[PDB]
Amino acid sequence: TSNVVLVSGEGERFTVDKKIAERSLLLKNYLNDIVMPVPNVRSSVLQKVIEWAEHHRDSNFPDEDDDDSRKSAPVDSWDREFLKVDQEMLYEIILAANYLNIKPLLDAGCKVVAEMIRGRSPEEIRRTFDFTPEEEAAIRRE
Amino acid sequence: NRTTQLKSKHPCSVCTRRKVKCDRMIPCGNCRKRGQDSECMKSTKLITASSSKEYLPDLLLFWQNYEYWITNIGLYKTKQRDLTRTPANLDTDTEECMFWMNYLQKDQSFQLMNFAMENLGALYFGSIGDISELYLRVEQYWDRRADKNHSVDGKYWDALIWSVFTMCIYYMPVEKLAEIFSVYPLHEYLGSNKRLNWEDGMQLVMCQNFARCSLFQLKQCDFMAHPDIRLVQAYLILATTTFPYDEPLLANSLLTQCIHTFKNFHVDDFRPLLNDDPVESIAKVTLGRIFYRLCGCDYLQSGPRKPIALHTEVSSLLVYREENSTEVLYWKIISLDRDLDQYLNKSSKPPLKTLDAIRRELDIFQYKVDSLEEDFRSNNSRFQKFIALFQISTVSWKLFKMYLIYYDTADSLLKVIHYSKVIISLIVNNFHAKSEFFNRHPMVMQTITRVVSFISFYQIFVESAAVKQLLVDLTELTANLPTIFGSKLDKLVYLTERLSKLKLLWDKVQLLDSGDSFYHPVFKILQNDIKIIELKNDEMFSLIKGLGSLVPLNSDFRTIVEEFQSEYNISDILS
Amino acid sequence: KEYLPDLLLFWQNYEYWITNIGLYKTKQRDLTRTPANLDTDTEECMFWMNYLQKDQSFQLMNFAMENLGALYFGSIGDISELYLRVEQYWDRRADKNHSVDGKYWDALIWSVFTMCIYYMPVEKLAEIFSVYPLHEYLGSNKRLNWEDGMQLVMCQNFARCSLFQLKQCDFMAHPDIRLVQAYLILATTTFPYDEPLLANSLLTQCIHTFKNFHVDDFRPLLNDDPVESIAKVTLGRIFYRLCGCDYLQSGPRKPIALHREENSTEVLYWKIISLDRDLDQYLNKSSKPPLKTLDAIRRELDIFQYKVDSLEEDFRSNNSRFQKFIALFQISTVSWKLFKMYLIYYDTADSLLKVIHYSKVIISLIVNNFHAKSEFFNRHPMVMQTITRVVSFISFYQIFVESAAVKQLLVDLTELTANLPTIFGSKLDKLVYLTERLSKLKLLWDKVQLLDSGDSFYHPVFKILQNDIKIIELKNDEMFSLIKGLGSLSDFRTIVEEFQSEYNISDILS
Ligand SMILES: [Zn+2]
Ligand SMILES: [Zn+2]
C-alpha cells in the first residue's frame, strides 16, 4: 500500500496510509481520479484528526443516512477522553472535520458541545439580553 | 449597490420613532445618510471592525444575473439577423453537397467506421446500440449510388450514416485524419489560402459541410411529411458536436420536430408489460434509451429561443422506475444540474434542506461512479469514466458556488478553489498522448467558461494569492484548448480580457459614497451589458419589420463609462 | 327493448373514430415504396410558375378583394396594400439573386393565389385560363374540363408551389410571422385533407414561431408607441384564429396543444368554437356531462343566438352575406350538437323534434345557396364536416328507430348529398360509400331474429360495428412503423365474414 500526503495550513507534510486516509470522503473523491492540501487547519489539529482516524480504522458507525434517527446512541469513553481539550481546539476539530467530511467525528464532537449546552447552571442563563432596551426592563420587572 | 454588514436583530429605535422602514445593516443605510451615527449605534454591542467591503453580497447576487445573461445566453444562444441582406438559398446546397459527396470515398468511410467502433462507443450506444450491424447499411449505401429512384427509408438510413460520419470527422485526432484524407481539391474548390492545413481550420469546415449534407438528405426525405425515429437518431448523433452552437435556432427547430416525432408514438411507460411480443419489448427498451438521451440534449438547449419544454414529470427531491444502466444515471446528474440552476433568473433563495439533499445525492453518485471496474484497454469505458467524473465535478462546483453566494458557509471559497483545481487536473491529465480528443466534448467548454468567468469576476474585487495563481492556471489552460471550438474559443478570450481591463478601472478611480448606496463606473458598465443583451433578445423589432411597412425609427463619470464602452464593446461577443 | 341506451353511448365512440378520425385525419403510408422526390418539385413548380401570367393574377386579386373578405380579414386585414407586393413580385421576376423577406412575401401571395383558385366559380375560372397546355404537359384526357377535376388539380399544385417557396426560404432557420400568415391563408381550403401530417408539422412550426415572441396580453397601453399597439392587436387577431385552427385538427396525430365593429365578430367566432370545444370534449371520454352544464350551454347559446340575430347585411355587400352565412351556420351546428347530446345522454321530451328542427334549418341553409352568384358559399369545409356528422347520425338512428318523418328526412339528406360541389372530389365519394354501407346495414337488422342471453344481446350488426372501431384503432398505431424504423425487424361468424368480405371498411381510408 503506497501512502498518501496531506498538507496542513502551516506547511507541514504529513504522510499516512491510504486505507485510513480514505475515512475522509474528500480524500476518497480526490484519489479516485499523491499530495493533497488541507488549508485552514493547524498542524496539531490535523495530527489529532489522523490519530482519531487511526484509532477507529476498523470501527462500525451507524449508518449512512439513518443518522439523526439512530442517533442518539452514546459515545465511547476513548473518544470522550480524546476530545477533553479546551474549547477553541474543539471548534477547530469540528471545523476541520466538516471540511474533511468525516461525519462520525462530527457527531461525537457535537454531542460533546451539546452536553456542555444541555446542562448549564441557572445562573449562567441569567445573562446577555431582544433589541428593546426599555421593554427589557419590563422583562426585568419579573 | 446597497451597503451591508452584521445584521443587527431589532429595528433601531431611531427609525421607529420616525416611522420609516429600517434597513438593519449596521448602523443603517438611513442614519448614515443624515449623520446621526452615534444615535443608532450607541445603545448596546459597540463592536466595530470596518472591513471596508460592504458592497460585496449584492455584487455576488448580481453575479447570478451576469452569468445568466452573458455566459449562457449571449455567447452561445444568440444570433441577430438581417432579412434584407441574407442571400436566398437558390442553389439549395445542391452544388455544395454534390461536391462534398463526390469527395468522400469508400475505404475512407470504412476506416472512419473502424475508428468509430473503436473509440466513440459511449456516445452512439445510448442512441442506436450496435454499430457493426450498421456496417450492412453502409454497404447498402455503397450499393445504391447510380440509381435514380430511392425509398424514404433508404434516404433515412443515409442521413443517419452521414450524421455518424460527421461525429467521426469531429472527434478525430489530426494525425490519423492527415493519414486518411487529402487536402488539395478542397483548396481548389473553396478558395481559402493554399497552405491552410488541418490544424489551421479545415477540420471545422469539413465537419460543418458534412452536417449540412446530412440535413440536405433529410430535406430530400420530405421529413416533415413522414414521422419516423431516424430524424430523432440523426439529431441525437449531431447533438454532441458544435452544431448546437453554429445555427442555434435551426437546432431549436429540429429539436421541436424531434419532440413532435417522439410524442407521436403515445408511449408513456417504458417497462415491458406481461403480455406482449418480445419484439415490442425490445422496441420499448430502445425507446427508453432514446427518450432519456433526448431529455438531456433537450435541457442543454434551454432559453428564450425555444419555449417547448419536454421535461414532463422529472425530479429528484424528497425517474426512479428505471434501471440505472448508463443513460438514467447520465440523466440524474443533469437533473440535479437543473435543480441547482433553476435559480439563476429567479429572485428567491433555495432553502437548506434542498441543498442538503443535493449534497447527499452528490455523495451517493460519487460512490456508485467510483464503484465501477473496467478494462484498461477498453478505451470506451475510460472515456465514459471521464465524462461521468467531469459532470460530477461540474455539479459539485456549482453547488458550492451557490453555497458561497447565497449563504457563505464555512470555508466555501476554498472549496470552490479545490473543485476548480480538480477540473484543471482532469483536463491537464488528459493533455497527454492518445487521449487528446477527450477535451473536445462541449461540456468542457461550458464548465471552463463558467470557471474562468467567476474567477475573473472575483479577481476584480477581492484579492488573495491563491486566487491569483488559480487565475494564472485558468489562463494557461484556456491558452491551449483544442482549435475545434474555433472562433467560439476566441470570444471567451475576449471576455476575460475585458474583465482584466475592468480591474484597472477599479484601481485608478476611488469608490464614491452616498451614505446608503455606492457609485462607480464599473457598476454601470456591468449593468449596461445585461441591458444591451436583453435588448438584443426582444423579438418585437423583427415582428414590426415583418408585418409590413411599419418601420421603426427609434460629471466625468458618464464620460469614463462612455469611453470604456467606446473602446471595449460588449457586442463583439455576437456574430 | 333495453338495448337502446348503450347503443346510443356506442354512437359517441363510433362517431369519434369513423367520422372524424377515419374519413379525414388518417393516412396510411409505405416508407419502402414512397418515391423520395429527388427533383424536389423543381420541374413541377417551375412549370406551374412559368404558366401563370400577370393581369390574370390581378383579376384573381380583384375577385379576392370583392368577394372573399370574411376569411382573410382574420389574418391580414386589408389586401389592397398587398397589391404593392404583387407589383414587387413582377418587379423581382427575372433576377439572379434574391433575399429572405421578399421570398416570404412571395409565399404569402402564392397562398392567397391558391385561395383565389380554390373559391373561384367555374364561369370566370373558365374565362381566365386555358386548358390546352395542361394536357400538353400532364397528358390526361382532353375532355377533362374544370368541373371534371382540373380545378382541384390546379389548387393542389399552387399549394405545392407555395410550400416550395417556403422551403426555398429555409423557414426553420429564419422564423418570421409570414409562415403563420401563409399557413392561415392555406388552412381555409381543403389542403388540410390532402396531406394531414404535413399540415400538422407546419402547424407545430406555427406554434413554435408564435411562442418565439413571448406575448401574453394583447391590451394596448397608454405609455407605448402606437406601433406596438397596432402590432399587439394584429397579434391578438392571429392568436385567436390560430387557436381556432388548432381545434379543427385535434386527435392522435398532433399532440402539442395550445388552448367595436368586426373584432366583436371575431370574439363571436371564438366563443362559438369554444362552446363547440366544451361540447365535443365528451366524445371519447366515458364521462356524462350533467344537466347544469347543458342548461348553461343552452342559455349562453340563446344569448349568442340573439346576438347573431342582432347582426345585419346588405345584398350588394356580398361579403356581409357570406359572413352572416358562416355565423348562422356555426350557431346552427353547435345547436344541433347540443340537442344531439340531449337526446343521447338524457332523452328529454322533444329532443328528437329539436334535432329534426335544426336539421331542417341546416338543410335550408345549404339548399338556399343554390341560386346564382351564391355557389362558392358551399365550398367551405365546415359544411363538409357538418354534413358528415348529420347524415351519419340520421342513418344510425334510422336503422334502430323507424319513423316516417325521419325517413323523409333521410331521403332529403341523401338527395342533398349528391349535389355538393365537385371540389371535394374523391373525398366526397367516400362519404357516399359510408351512407350506402349503412343502408345495407339496415337490411341485416331486418332479416335476423335478435337473440338473448338473459343479460346481454347478440346480433351481427353489433359485431360489425365493433370490428370497424377495432380495425381503425389498429390502423392508428405507429408501432409497426417504429419496428420497421429501428432495424430490419354458429353461422353468426359466417354472416359477419360474408358482409365484411363484401363491404370492406378500408375503402374509407386513403
Ligand atoms: Zn430602526
Ligand atoms: Zn438607525
Author numbering:
A (entry chain D): 3 to 35, 75 to 170, 175 to 187
B (entry chain B): 3 to 320, 334 to 569, 588 to 608
C (entry chain A): 55 to 313, 336 to 565, 588 to 608
Provide excerpts from the study.
The centromere is distinguished by the presence of nucleosomes containing the histone H3 variant, CENP‐A. In budding yeast, centromere establishment begins with the recognition of a specific DNA sequence by the CBF3 complex. The ~445‐kDa CBF3 complex consists of four proteins: Ndc10, Cep3, Ctf13 and Skp1 present in a 2:2:1:1 stoichiometry (Lechner & Carbon, 1991; Doheny et al, 1993; Lechner, 1994; Strunnikov et al, 1995; Stemmann & Lechner, 1996; Russell et al, 1999; Espelin et al, 1997). Previous studies have suggested that Ndc10 and Cep3 constitute the DNA‐binding activities of the complex. Both Ndc10 and Cep3 are capable of directly binding DNA (Espelin et al, 1997; Purvis & Singleton, 2008; Cho & Harrison, 2011; Perriches & Singleton, 2012); in the case of Cep3, sequence specificity for the CDEIII element is provided by zinc‐containing Gal4‐type DNA‐binding domains (Strunnikov et al, 1995; Espelin et al, 1997).
Here, we present the structure of the 220‐kDa Cep3‐Ctf13‐Skp1 (henceforth “core”) complex determined by cryo‐electron microscopy at an overall resolution of 3.6 Å. The density clearly shows that the N‐terminal F‐box forms part of a small helical domain, which is followed by seven leucine‐rich repeats (LRRs), placing Ctf13 in the sub‐class of FBXLs (F‐box proteins containing LRRs; Kipreos & Pagano, 2000). Interestingly, the Ctf13 F‐box/Skp1 interaction present in our structure is significantly different from all currently known examples, with substantially altered positioning of the helices in both the F‐box and Skp1. Our structure also highlights the function of a previously unresolved loop between residues 105 and 112 in Skp1 in forming inter‐subunit contacts. The structure provides an answer to this question. As previously described, one of the Cep3 Gal4 domains is stabilised by interactions with both Ctf13 and the F‐box binding segment of Skp1, with clear density visible at the tip of one Cep3 monomer, close to the N‐terminal of the crystal structures. The quality of the density is sufficient to visualise the Zn2Cys6 cluster, assign the correct amino acid sequence and the build the likely path of the loop connecting the domain to the rest of the Cep3 protein. By superimposing the crystal structure of the homologous Hap1 domain (King et al, 1999) bound to DNA on the Cep3 Gal4 domain, we can trace the likely path of the DNA. This modelling clearly shows a severe clash between the DNA and the LRRs of Ctf13, indicating that this domain is likely incapable of DNA binding once the complex has formed. It should be noted that we obtained the core structure without pre‐treatment with λ‐phosphatase; therefore, the presented structure likely represents an inactive state of the core complex.
